[PDB]
Amino acid sequence: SDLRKEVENHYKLSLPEDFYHFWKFCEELDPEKPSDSLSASLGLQLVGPYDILAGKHKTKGLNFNLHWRFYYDPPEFQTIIIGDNKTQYHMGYFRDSPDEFPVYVGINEAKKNCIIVPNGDNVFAAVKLFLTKKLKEITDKKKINLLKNIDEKLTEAARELGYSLEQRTVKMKQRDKKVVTKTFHGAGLVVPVDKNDVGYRELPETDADLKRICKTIVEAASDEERLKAFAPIQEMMTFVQFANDECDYGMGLELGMDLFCYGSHYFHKVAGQLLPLAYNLLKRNLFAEIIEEHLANRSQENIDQL
Amino acid sequence: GKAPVDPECTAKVGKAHVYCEGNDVYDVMLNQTNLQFNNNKYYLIQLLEDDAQRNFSVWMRWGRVGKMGQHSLVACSGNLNKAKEIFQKKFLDKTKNNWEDREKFEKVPGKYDMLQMDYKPESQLDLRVQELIKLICNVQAMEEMMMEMKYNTKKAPLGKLTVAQIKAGYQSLKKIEDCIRAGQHGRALMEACNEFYTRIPHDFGLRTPPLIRTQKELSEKIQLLEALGDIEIAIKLVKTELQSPEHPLDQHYRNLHCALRPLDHESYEFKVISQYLQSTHAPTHSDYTMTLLDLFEVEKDGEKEAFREDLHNRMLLWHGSRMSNWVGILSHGLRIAPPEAPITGYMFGKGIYFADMSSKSANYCFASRLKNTGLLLLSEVALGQCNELLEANPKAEGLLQGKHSTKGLGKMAPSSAHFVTLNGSTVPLGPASDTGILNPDGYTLNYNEYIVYNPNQVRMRYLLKVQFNFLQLW
Amino acid sequence: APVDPECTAKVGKAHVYCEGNDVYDVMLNQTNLQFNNNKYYLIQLLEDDAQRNFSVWMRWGRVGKMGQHSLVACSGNLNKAKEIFQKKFLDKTKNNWEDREKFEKVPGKYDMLQ
Numbered sequence: 001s002d003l004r005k006e007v008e009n010h011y012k013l014s015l016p017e018d019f020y021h022f023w024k025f026c027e028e029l030d031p032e033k034p035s036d037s038l039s040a041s042l043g044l045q046l047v048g049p050y051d052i053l054a055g056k057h058k059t060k061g062l063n064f065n066l067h068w069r070f071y072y073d074p075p076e077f078q079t080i081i082i083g084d085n086k087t088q089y090h091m092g093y094f095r096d097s098p099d100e101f102p103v104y105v106g107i108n109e110a111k112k113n114c115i116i117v118p119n120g121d122n123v124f125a126a127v128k129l130f131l132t133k134k135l136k137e138i139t140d141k142k143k144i145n146l147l148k149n150i151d152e153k154l155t156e157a158a159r160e161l162g163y164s165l166e167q168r169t170v171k172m173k174q175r176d177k178k179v180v181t182k183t184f185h186g187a188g189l190v191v192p193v194d195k196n197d198v199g200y201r202e203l204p205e206t207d208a209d210l211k212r213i214c215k216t217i218v219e220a221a222s223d224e225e226r227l228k229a230f231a232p233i234q235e236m237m238t239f240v241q242f243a244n245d246e247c248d249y250g251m252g253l254e255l256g257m258d259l260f261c262y263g264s265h266y267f268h269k270v271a272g273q274l275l276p277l278a279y280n281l282l283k284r285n286l287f288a289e290i291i292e293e294h295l296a297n298r299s300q301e302n303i304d305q306l
Numbered sequence: 307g308k309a310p311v312d313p314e315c316t317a318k319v320g321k322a323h324v325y326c327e328g329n330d331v332y333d334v335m336l337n338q339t340n341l342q343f344n345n346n347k348y349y350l351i352q353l354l355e356d357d358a359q360r361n362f363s364v365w366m367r368w369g370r371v372g373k374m375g376q377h378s379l380v381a382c383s384g385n386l387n388k389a390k391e392i393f394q395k396k397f398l399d400k401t402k403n404n405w406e407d408r409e410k411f412e413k414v415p416g417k418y419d420m421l422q423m424d425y426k427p428e429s430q431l432d433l434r435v436q437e438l439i440k441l442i443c444n445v446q447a448m449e450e451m452m453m454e455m456k457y458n459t460k461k462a463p464l465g466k467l468t469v470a471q472i473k474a475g476y477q478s479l480k481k482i483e484d485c486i487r488a489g490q491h492g493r494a495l496m497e498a499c500n501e502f503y504t505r506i507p508h509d510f511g512l513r514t515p516p517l518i519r520t521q522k523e524l525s526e527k528i529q530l531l532e533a534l535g536d537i538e539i540a541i542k543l544v545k546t547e548l549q550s551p552e553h554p555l556d557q558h559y560r561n562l563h564c565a566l567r568p569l570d571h572e573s574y575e576f577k578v579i580s581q582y583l584q585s586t587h588a589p590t591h592s593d594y595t596m597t598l599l600d601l602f603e604v605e606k607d608g609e610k611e612a613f614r615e616d617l618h619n620r621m622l623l624w625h626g627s628r629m630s631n632w633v634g635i636l637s638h639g640l641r642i643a644p645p646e647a648p649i650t651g652y653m654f655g656k657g658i659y660f661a662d663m664s665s666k667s668a669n670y671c672f673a674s675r676l677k678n679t680g681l682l683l684l685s686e687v688a689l690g691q692c693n694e695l696l697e698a699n700p701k702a703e704g705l706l707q708g709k710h711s712t713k714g715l716g717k718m719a720p721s722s723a724h725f726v727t728l729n730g731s732t733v734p735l736g737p738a739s740d741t742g743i744l745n746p747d748g749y750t751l752n753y754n755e756y757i758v759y760n761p762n763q764v765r766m767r768y769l770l771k772v773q774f775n776f777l778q779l780w
Numbered sequence: 781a782p783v784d785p786e787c788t789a790k791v792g793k794a795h796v797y798c799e800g801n802d803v804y805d806v807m808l809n810q811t812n813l814q815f816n817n818n819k820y821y822l823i824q825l826l827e828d829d830a831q832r833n834f835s836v837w838m839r840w841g842r843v844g845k846m847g848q849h850s851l852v853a854c855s856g857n858l859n860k861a862k863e864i865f866q867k868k869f870l871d872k873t874k875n876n877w878e879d880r881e882k883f884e885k886v887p888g889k890y891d892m893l894q
Contacts, residue, residue, distance in 0.1 A: 195748065198698065242670075265780050266779065267779075270780070379789070
């Protein structure tokens with residue numbers, strides 16, 4: 001516990017206990033380099049707060065909101081494991097608010113798409129799912145025994161700690177009932193909703209039509225053509241103002257997120273006007289900080305120890 | 307009124323006219339929808355006789371509303387009798403109503419329903435009012451906005467509507483409100499939704515038309531219908547006029563029947579209004595600024611006698627709306643919502659709505675980067691004693707019991723300590739600050755708003771010409 | 781290969797366009813007793829006398845009966861009319877118009893009248 005508080009003080013976020021227990025698990029597997037204990041076997045790397053666990057942050061300006069923050073990792077998303085650097089495959093805890101625990105572990109390929117795929121509710125589940133999926137992907141049999149042994153250790157540790165190993169747990173299916181919309185990232189929004197349905201309202205445009213709007217705007221051949229084409233974004237932003245004035249904050253939360261998912265620099269400012277404010281209105285100030293810093297410095301290489 | 311021919315009949319748009327006989331104009335649009343079986347289709351019929359040569363034709367065109375469809379042109383070489391027969395027969399087949407007595411129309415289930423359509427210069431005026439009128443009286447811009455109300459936002463694909471058609475739509479929204487009020491999502495609800503989608507043409511692509519299930523969609527539909535009515539009144543008002551005007555806008559100005567006088571930038575009134583505009587820009591509407599370009603004095607006839615001068619608590623409050631519809635307000639003043647309109651769409655009831663924070667009302671202007679000009683109107687409103695509301699309750703109007711207006715208690719708002727005066731009316735200067743109203747049971751309203759019910763309690767006083775200045779976009 | 785008299789909206793006032801092999805007038809038939817398909821489809825290009833002002837006639841239905849028909853006007857340019865004609869023929873037969881000579885009846889597509 002004595003090495004936990006410095007970790008969580010650095011991130012301004014609380015980390016669940018499975019994170020630290022998995023640290024101890026990997027330490028027992030390989031005391032010399034626990035973070036990379038699965039790197040020789042799986043090609044995966046423990047990073048982020050594990051970097052603090054490894055003491056590798058002691059080489060040093062250190063901005064942890066960007067540490068391994070991939071191009072499409074939403075502020076809700078805290079990268080914890082890296083895989084293929086060609087596709088920027090990675091796994092991370094997903095937190096809806098800075099005061100809550102992660103709801104599950106998601107995976108994304110930042111060079112492939114913006115979709116975050118649920119991968120269990122804890123890192124044991126995430127690594128087991130990746131391991132099992134690769135076991136069939138691997139075109140060999142001799143080089144599998146090591147994976148069987150490490151997987152055996154994974155299963156026994158999860159059983160001893162009382163963790164379910166399902167890809168989708170009970171708590172995730174409960175959150176999904178609280179999930180109000182997928183918002184191009186597929187992970188769902190959690191916003192306050194009172195007994196009069198106050199707190200959220202849907203966008204004036206469908207998701208497919210929103211993606212079409214983004215395509216037609218980003219592909220405009222001149223800035224004058226964009227300004228003429230910009231009319232639907234301006235309209236949607238005015239209605240977003242209307243909604244926030246009536247406490248339906250999540251709408252302004254969602255629209256910016258879609259632009260965050262779209263990825264074009266032409267939308268960096270407008271999202272910076274929508275997403276931070278929405279987080280401020282939602283009292284998620286840390287996410288406003290994260291989105292400000294990321295939009296100002298959204299890079300394709302993000303290991304702060306380089 | 308002026309009877310237009312469908313332009314899509316290129317072979318006859320310039321050589322032919324729609325047929326008329328007194329009341330009876332042989333033009334008709336039918337709509338059908340059944341979400342139970344996912345039908346949503348239209349059918350237009352028009353009898354056209356050529357202008358040059360004596361030859362009659364029936365034009366029919368049908369498809370999904372919004373998506374242009376299959377058409378047929380049947381020529382008759384002047385066989386007006388046969389053609390009229392065919393017209394009436396098809397009208398009956400598709401409606402189960404006879405055409406000639408179209409007045410007594412009765413829709414039947416599983417058949418198309420009807421709808422109703424609209425088918426020596428000394429220009430002496432101040433230059434500033436001239437620019438204002440030309441801005442608001444620009445017919446081109448009204449046409450362009452109407453076309454955008456069909457091909458940009460598919461709210462009225464096929465065309466426009468009549469006042470009475472809108473009233474029938476409101477009747478259907480009332481039936482929907484009654485249905486939904488009991489939370490029953492069975493068959494009657496689906497039929498009521500069918501009636502709604504029949505009366506007001508929507509385009510759902512292919513996805514089954516969804517059930518209207520919550521209050522938010524009710525209120526959105528209500529606002530759509532309101533925008534339809536607004537466009538109708540705007541085109542009615544912009545009717546051009548002859549008789550030696552030498553500046554037709556001067557007759558349009560008479561149609562405003564509202565004195566609008568230019569104010570000097572250095573006058574106390576102009577500076578104070580600018581102070582009020584700037585000091586009350588909410589901080590959470592920071593995607594743009596606003597500059598006061600010009601300010602006009604308002605003198606609307608008949609309002610003076612109506613004002614509730616006896617009532618205390620008189621303040622100047624904002625009211626925003628799109629650049630185009632202002633022509634209606636200046637001619638007729640602000641109106642309470644349509645009575646036939648469902649009450650449950652307005653979380654705190656009907657009436658006239660005002661803010662004291664410029665940016666909150668200003669959000670209702672929908673100004674743009676390309677089109678950077680918007681208007682905000684200031685009105686003196688005698689609120690009298692306000693009824694205090696913490697949480698949404700659409701039934702606020704019954705709770706008045708002697709009060710004259712409702713206040714919705716927002717988290718952020720100016721405090722009376724900073725209030726100033728203008729011509730004996732209270733001017734509620736900002737900045738916004740915390741008001742110590744909170745809710746240990748539910749949500750908290752973001753910002754106050756004030757609503758009045760008697761139309762006689764509003765007196766428009768100045769019209770503000772405002773440049774909305776947007777900023778960097780990426 | 782006569783102009784259809786059943787096209788009352790166009791009979792009398794125009795002459796169908798052709799070019800040797802490439803005859804932009806044709807009637808196609810498809811019979812298929814398994815599915816009780818028996819349908820025809822005529823296509824005809826008509827030219828104005830005064831100006832280069834063309835029209836495409838389509839007519840289709842169960843054999844014998846006029847069924848339905850469509851007039852697509854191409855006063856713009858005859859080449860547009862060739863585009864519509866040839867593209868539609870390909871869509872409907874899976875055979876190109878230039879290669880129409882080597883017709884191979886694929887199942888469920890029109891063959892013409894020899």
